């Protein structure tokens, strides 16, 4: 259906801004922040029918989610939170909400020029992570 075509591919992190403060807001402890902040993940996005798969491969952790838009699922995040996630498309932006322990964070993924831009928000704190084609 050509849903999410422009996201599909293999992407490499090239910049991160304010990720330490985002992780602090999420509740990540010191050692995980330091090590996770160093990581330069490879994000691999694929689509098969209605199922979107996003993998993240790095020195810190290899993670993978598969999902159908609008349909809640279980995700264990790289920092080991057990969250309930729902991902939708809003005007061409993938919007991913994670719920756990009465908390919530929202991750947006957008195509901007030749980049895939990831915006991570926890209360008033945003981090921006920019990926390029690998
Ligand atoms: O860049 C991504 O694709 C990404 C998208 C949404 C949330 C993420 O981190 C959540 C998070 C919250 C709290 C702690 C770590 C990660 C992400 O980094 C994963 C990551 C980061 C570092 C190392 C490996 C993988």
């Amino acid at each position: 259906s050509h849903m999410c075509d422009a996201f599909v591919g293999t992407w490499k992190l090239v910049s991160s801004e304010n990720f330490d403060d985002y992780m602090k807001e999420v509740g990540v402890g010191f050692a995980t922040r330091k090590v996770a902040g160093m990581a330069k993940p490879n994000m691999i996005i694929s689509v098969n029918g209605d199922v979107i798969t996003i993998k993240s491969e790095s020195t810190f952790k290899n993670t993978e989610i598969s999902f159908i838009l609008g349909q809640e699922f279980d995700e264990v995040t790289a920092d080991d939170r057990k969250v309930k996630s729902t991902i939708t498309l809003d005007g061409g932006v993938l919007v991913h909400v994670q719920k756990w322990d009465g908390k919530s964070t929202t991750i947006k993924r957008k195509r901007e020029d030749d980049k895939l831009v990831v915006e991570c928000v926890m209360k008033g704190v945003t981090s921006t992570r920019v990926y390029e084609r690998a």
Side-chain angles (χ1 to χ4, degrees), residues 86-114:
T86 307
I87 303 181
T88 55
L89 215 35
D90 174 19
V93 176
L94 282 164
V95 180
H96 179 180
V97 181
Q98 297 177 331
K99 303 299 193 182
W100 77 104
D101 296 346
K103 301 178 200 178
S104 188
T105 186
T106 297
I107 303 146
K108 291 184 185 181
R109 299 170 175 94
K110 317 168 173 182
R111 278 296 308 275
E112 186 160 88
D113 303 313
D114 288 321

Side-chain angles (χ1 to χ4, degrees), residues 24-103:
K24 285 186 176 180
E25 213 69 9
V26 169
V28 184
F30 179 89
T32 298
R33 293 201 312 282
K34 296 302 174 188
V35 175
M38 293 292 301
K40 294 286 181 153
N42 181 193
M43 192 192 319
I44 310 107
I45 302 178
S46 60
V47 180
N48 182 326
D50 293 337
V51 183
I52 303 163
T53 300
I54 305 178
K55 298 174 56 173
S56 181
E57 308 199 334
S58 73
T59 57
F60 179 61
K61 213 69 69 172
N62 300 323
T63 63
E64 170 176 342
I65 59 175
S66 292
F67 59 92
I68 295 172
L69 293 170
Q71 301 193 0
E72 187 169 58
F73 64 98
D74 295 312
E75 175 179 9
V76 176
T77 65
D79 60 311
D80 279 320
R81 285 175 286 127
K82 284 50 161 170
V83 311
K84 296 290 178 174
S85 287
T86 307
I87 303 181
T88 55
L89 215 35
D90 174 19
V93 176
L94 282 164
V95 180
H96 179 180
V97 181
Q98 297 177 331
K99 303 299 193 182
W100 77 104
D101 296 346
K103 301 178 200 178

